[model samples]
Target: MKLERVTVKNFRSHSDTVVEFKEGINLIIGQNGSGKSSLLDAILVGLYWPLRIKDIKKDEFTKVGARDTYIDLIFEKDGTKYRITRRFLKGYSSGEIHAMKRLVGNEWKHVTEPSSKAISAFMEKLIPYNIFLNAIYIRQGQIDAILESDEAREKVVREVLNKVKKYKALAREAALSKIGELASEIFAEFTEGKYSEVVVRAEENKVRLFVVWEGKERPLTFLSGGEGIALGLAFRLAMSLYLAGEISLLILDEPTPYLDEERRRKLITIMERYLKKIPQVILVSHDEELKDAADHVIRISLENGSSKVEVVS
Candidate 1:
């Protein structure tokens, strides 16, 4: 899905502000301490707030001193526009924080079902928050995991494989063999196109990842750092493409950490490939290397305490 516009009122450092997002690819740029991270956080909160980000409280999401807080988010999926509104109060109340959504021509409807349990269920159906956190969304610190310890490297693939298995389980229960087939195609396309073919298969008890460097097969441990990261990201992208269904909005924050020129090219290729999905992608980076893959750049900065965003072609 594409985030059309977002208006944050008394939330965090953003006080009464609106920002628009593009379709294909958007690069959000800003220096540290500027509101780049905050802007991404706001979008995540607008779509899947409170449910995730367990470290923060609902009221705390409100401005430091502001009593009321809310995020008005507008998103478009398959030509249908949806408005999701989330409100937070200073103190606990029956209606302190309310979540609601409205179709393009329909009346405003509450997503909550007398309790937050309903809220959780509703948002999950709209956006697979857990799947995203597990694999779809990539963060700065996470970019270097492929170069980390042997254990860390395996952990990365393990995370992606686990999410795939989860979706496979869903496919089994729903009896949707197509999803499973799509999953296989994702792994095949991802690993087959490159120099070495990579394959990840799910067994009854374990998930196995293999690399076909030469005519022989080796474990994921045999691949180089670049190939390792490439397969890791490609696997995640394929799964994201599958679960994303129609609207696949990918958000990347400083994805390339200590990447060389060739590795950077691979990264850019993935960004361009992932953009072919329905909604689009929002990437936050200081390096202009990835700009070629973006439709435009939305530069953000902190003026006083509010966010100032501008579009630069």
Candidate 2:
């Protein structure tokens, strides 16, 4: 799905904020602790709250002294528009309010019950939580594991396999093969032919990942920090395409922390030239150079204990 707008109220550092997104690359730029990531977190909470999958507590999202907090998300899917609002109150058992509405001929109509469980089930069907987490949202420091030992990369692959099993084993092998091929292409593009291929092989009960450099296949852990990050990003985009099938939004938070200047510029090039497959991309980062590649830029800053957002372009 593509996100059109988000409204966050009394959530974390955001006292009240509204941000609009575009179809191409949208960048949320800010300094450290400027609440850039909080905006993306609001979207996540809007989609899936009280599920315990994100390791975030609902109450923790409320502003420091506010009695309640809510998030409103407007998005589109399959040629229709939808809005989901989730509210959380302090010290009230089951005070969470969940509602989803669809635009019908310019009028909004309720699409599901207000109950949290009902909304959660509805959203799960609309966008499976496992796939959203594994494929769509690339959290901070997520891909750095590629720089770790082989066992660590193996564990990550196994986790992906277990998550992909939610679609049943029938599509598992095909998904892996497609992910491998697509990731290979993405890696080659991001690295500018430094790495030509990525091989994801499932052997017996284990899955092994390899990267082809200079016509030699090497374990995923053999790459440098920047190369590992690029491979991780390639795998993430590839997984998003194959697993979600029709995913329209890709959210990345601080994806260039460990990369050097050259690698960061390469990432900017990838964003400009290689991301046409996904319709909408929301990237949160403190890197100033990334602004050159954004279709729309939103700047966030802290003023008087609240996060202020401005549209730069």
Candidate 3:
């Protein structure tokens, strides 16, 4: 799936703006408060509204003097064009949200109350919301703690295993049934033999993790920072592959913070390598140095308190 264009109306600082995107890398660069982050938030809102963000609220999308807000999103998959329109009323309460499939000559068939929900469900079938997020979206400091702080190891594990918990329930339901096969397959795929195995003991209500290397077995807990971050990234990618079958799109919002030069370069290398496999990558940043990594660069700026985009490349 690919996003083609987005129309924002009274969404945060994007008063009335329409931005178009390409198939490959789209790098957005701008000064602080120029609304780069707001653009990312707009995409999230378009894809999944009523979802919360830190330090942001639905009402936040309403322009200072406006009482209503809306977003028109256009995307493509399998040679068809789809549009999703979501609206918000006063105080940012949910309003009319609809989905349509465009036919030849601009005719749109309204995909028939259950409209948004059905479309969302179909969208989920095409790409589940969480998997879409896991595969596509990145935010500032998302992996910094995973690589830097021991205190944050719990956070990293939670983020990595959040989706795994669903399967654990499946493991329980299918206890002694498909557990062996699915777990064996997923664990084997997830660990890549770097970790020996994941044993789910339903009777004991415990899942045991193990690792073996150089003819010795050890707990994954024994892995230090750099070691774990490497595998953590691999684990996430593997999980995405296992669940989604492919990582076609990715978006990173200000992902270069909280790292020294060498580590940042390493992170860039990893990101570049991962992005090469995907058909599209939309990256938002303040780092001009990263322009070289982009096939297209969009510069956002604030003028008259509204956001504007200039295609610099």
Candidate 4:
């Protein structure tokens, strides 16, 4: 799935704006604060808002006061139009995602309280820009930060890789953990057999994954930001390839936090291998290597505090 076009209304810096996306690899580049990130964030808000960040981010439309905050995103996918909108009330304290989809010739259908599971399922064919940006998306402060530390690289891999397998199991669990749904399990009835599970053997090279369910407490750590982040991105990349059916859009804020150039390109190569099977990606970055992989490129520029989107050759 591709986001053919996007528009934002009175959300951030721009009062009203519209943008488009390309097939295959799309690259976005621009100067700092040019609203490139804002555009990306809005795309995020548009897609993941209402349910994820809208109210959480406060929807401060009034800027400083007066009244209300508003956000709206529009995108065309496969001739189907999807729209997500939200409004923030100064005194109000809650917000949620509201979604509407219209097929090429069909009437609009509304979807509410869109769960991550449902969203992920909708994206399994082609994961959302958010998922792409997640591990692939690197930010300034986030860039220099590595997921694996020299001191604990091996242990970090052992831990995260295991967790990755475990996480995948959770994804496949009979009942989605996030949603307290009911299901039948072939394994064990740990928690009413409502949830299926996976366990990973982890870190033996050749990309071996240990998957188990209804087990004991695995020694996964919550600290070590670097490993947690790096491994999570790696796992996401792998999963996107494995599951993403068509084009995959991957957004990287300040890519290259963990490895050197050689390794970075190698990872891209690994991801490309998946692209052959599934996954077309949109990579947002300041670095230009992504240009080599791009079918469409948007360079964000700053013009007196305003944003200018351009096409790159």
Candidate whose lDDT is highest: 2
Q: How displaced is residue 180 in candidate 4, in Å?
A: 27
User: Model 1 over residues 159-204: C-alpha lDDT tens digits?
Assistant: 5444999996875444223333454455455445544354444454
Q: Which residues of candidate 4, in runs, are more than 4 Å off?
A: 54-56, 59-72, 75-79, 87-99, 104-147, 150-234, 239-249, 257-279
Question: Using TM-score as the measure, what is the rank order of every candidate, best first?
Answer: 2, 1, 3, 4
Per-prediction TM-score to the true structure, in the order listed? 0.73, 0.85, 0.71, 0.54
Q: Which stretches of candidate 3 lie over 4 Å from their true place?
A: 51-56, 61-67, 89-97, 103-106, 163-235, 267-274
Per-residue lDDT of model 4, residues 179-270, tens digit only:
11111121112222322432323233322222233454222243244333334343334433333322344555545433556545644553
lDDT of 2 by residue, 264-313 (tens): 87677778887655688888988878899888899999989999998998
Q: By TM-score, who's the top model here? A: 2
Better of 1 and 4 by TM-score: 1
Model 3 error, position 244 (Å) = 2.2
Winner by lDDT between candidate 4 and candidate 3? 3
TM-score of 1: 0.73
Residue-level error in angstroms, candidate 1, position 158: 5.3
Q: How are the candidates ranked when ordered by lDDT, highest leading?
A: 2, 3, 1, 4
Of candidates 2 and 1, the better by lDDT: 2
Residue 94 C-alpha lDDT in model 3: 44
Greater-TM-score candidate between 1 and 3: 1
- lDDT of all predictions, in order shown? 0.63, 0.79, 0.63, 0.46
Q: Cα RMSD (Å) between model 2 and the true structure?
A: 3.8
